Design a protein around this ligand. Sequence first.
Ligand SMILES: *C/C=C(C)/C=C/C=C(C)/C=C/C1=C(C)CCCC1(C)C
Ligand SMILES: CCCCCCCC/C=C\CCCCCCCC(=O)O
Ligand SMILES: CCCCCCCC/C=C\CCCCCCCC(=O)O
Ligand SMILES: [Cl-]
Ligand SMILES: [Cl-]
Length: 264
Amino acid sequence: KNIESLFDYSAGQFEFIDHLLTMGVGVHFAALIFFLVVSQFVAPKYRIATALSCIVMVSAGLILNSQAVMWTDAYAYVDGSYQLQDLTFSNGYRYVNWMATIPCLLLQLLIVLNLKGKELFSTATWLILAAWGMIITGYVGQLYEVDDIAQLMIWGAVSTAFFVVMNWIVGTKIFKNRATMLGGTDSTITKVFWLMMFAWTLYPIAYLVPAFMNNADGVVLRQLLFTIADISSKVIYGLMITYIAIQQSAAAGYVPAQQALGRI
Ligand SMILES: *C/C=C(C)/C=C/C=C(C)/C=C/C1=C(C)CCCC1(C)C
Ligand SMILES: CCCCCCCC/C=C\CCCCCCCC(=O)O
Ligand SMILES: CCCCCCCC/C=C\CCCCCCCC(=O)O
Ligand SMILES: [Cl-]
Ligand SMILES: [Cl-]
């Protein structure tokens, strides 16, 4: 059981959540068209990093669209407020989606870091195992956000341990392979690390909202934090990854990338 089910919502709270989720869909699908069109300017070595941004945009866009429809299915305006009907709304579906989206985000970073062969395969496997441990333990913890806050906290601590180990793998790989990067992207990639540290830390903050703001305004805050975090961790991040891919492509002599950069 999730905290959303405990409350009735004002028309203001209900409509704001619907608009946040709907705006989220729009931003991700608008970004998808950008990544699709610029993929032709990326060298073959990096083209999979731009394709992964397209995959993340549709995956995230579809979960946000699903959440928006589930939100409107679950509530109806009755006696002056939006009240729970027969259908349920939950954040559980986002956790399931992270099982696919987090590995995609991590893989596109490894590609632009110029990792290849055995090092790429072994780094991706450890990263994906750490990401899955984080997601599964978090998914279990949030099943107790109404019934048992102590259990939410302890599964949250286990999940945070996987998060910290994953961030150490990411940081280690970034600061080690920064020197292999072309066209000044050795500087850009350090900003990508900090963007990840910031954006990804908003998810455990949203996870703890039932512990510090268990009310209808807390429900709104959690959807707002997921909105900021999704746009930063998927869209802004994807735009930086694509910039890095095109810049390294042009530095390596890929003529469509040089022509695209020269045109802007
Ligand atoms: C596009 C979606 C992304 C980048 C999701 C990232 C999710 C996390 C970094 C989740 C982390 C969590 C903890 C560190 C503790 C509480 C449980 C989680 C799973 C919310
Ligand atoms: C990268 C940042 C992306 C985030 C964009 C989201 C912008 C819109 C967010 C907040 C505006 C504040 C709206 C006021 C909330 C009204 C409270 C209520 O529900 O009654
Ligand atoms: C119904 C939802 C409303 C639709 C939202 C459409 C607005 C799209 C605006 C921004 C999305 C960001 C797309 C990223 C392209 C990068 C642009 C750039 O080069 O700076
Ligand atoms: Cl190539
Ligand atoms: Cl997602």
